[PDB]
Amino acid sequence: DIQMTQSPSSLSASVGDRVTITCRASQSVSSAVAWYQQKPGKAPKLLIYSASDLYSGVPSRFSGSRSGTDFTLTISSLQPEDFATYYCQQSHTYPITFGQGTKVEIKRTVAAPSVFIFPPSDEQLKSGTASVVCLLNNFYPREAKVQWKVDNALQSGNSQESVTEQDSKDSTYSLSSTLTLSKADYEKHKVYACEVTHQGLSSPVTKSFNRGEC
């Protein structure tokens, strides 16, 4: 049972750029590390069978090498067809294991989000619960979070998240985050806020509302 670690969690490269993704087995697996290319809705494509064994049907762009234990996977000239999550597989010792998967971004313009805070509506509150919703629209880099506050305290564990896909020209995407309070808990707090931070934002954007507004 040899587990492997992949990095980076995501890589940023344009069409025509180079992509470098690595995988490190905790134990030697010889060179028996295979790689896959996966698009949403599809099976991972087999790219590589072993560190120096490329699969026919895989673009010639795919190549790699080893340094000590670690294997480095690269794409020499990334095409639209290659934006996929890449995974490593070791076939040396059972159980067969896989790495975590590395995403590739199209490396475009960095921008702050348009921050929309949506206080729980009268209709949503008929459910008996209250969902405070904040959406960060059209921003880049890929990593962003909402620091949710209740009575200006930072709250952690009552939030939920979902993230959308990136724009093919700008690399931007939107982030959805919410806070769930029962209606009864919602009514017991006065101030709510969405403090928006991300890797490219030097000045956090905060939107807020008072309980009962909107």
Binding site: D1, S30, A32, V33, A34, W35, Y36, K42, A43, P44, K45, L46, I48, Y49, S50, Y55, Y87, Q89, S91, H92, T93, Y94, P95, I96, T97, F98, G99, Q100, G101, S114, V115, F116, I117, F118, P119, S121, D122, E123, Q124, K126, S127, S131, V133, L135, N137, Q160, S162, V163, T164, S174, S176, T178, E213, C214
Partner: protein, 223 residues
Amino acid sequence: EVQLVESGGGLVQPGGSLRLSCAASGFDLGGYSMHWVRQAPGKGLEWVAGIYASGGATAYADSVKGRFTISADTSKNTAYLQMNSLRAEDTAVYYCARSYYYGGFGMDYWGQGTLVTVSSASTKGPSVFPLAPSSKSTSGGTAALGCLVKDYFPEPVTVSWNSGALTSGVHTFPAVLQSSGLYSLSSVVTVPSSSLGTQTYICNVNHKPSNTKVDKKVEPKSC
């Protein structure tokens, strides 16, 4: 050309079981080990088990031992997975894949994956609620109306606006599976703010798998 084709997916009540199968096409399974792998929603790829088509020998991941059992039949040139005592945590797309002998080589032929789900609330329509727009415009002069879609099952759900006529300014998020055993997602439409009181904004939430749908109107409210 060699293909591997999966079937047999569907929902299993918690504690129940399901049989999956894949057929080989263009390739004789003998000489290869046939493998089952798993992809839970939001997760990466996990190996489940492998069987040597020409020998009957097997190996399993520790994570599935005592629960997932496999077999193969070279007269049929197919392979099978029997999953017992399925839990919510076992919701995943199950894949067939193959490799030479007993290892030292990665898997070459792959199926596309069939979804197996487990839930205590296997058949639900959506519950849809509107989100009031900010009354103050953001950069570009825009504002947005939205919906929260919750507690439906199974996924996929298709969400669009104005009964499907509105794609312009539409921002949708993927569904995720919640602790309720049901799925949820959200969406907004961002347009110049005066358009929010002119255009129709109805969330068309379609669930072909549940034979249902919801048309929820969203409009500006004092804010």
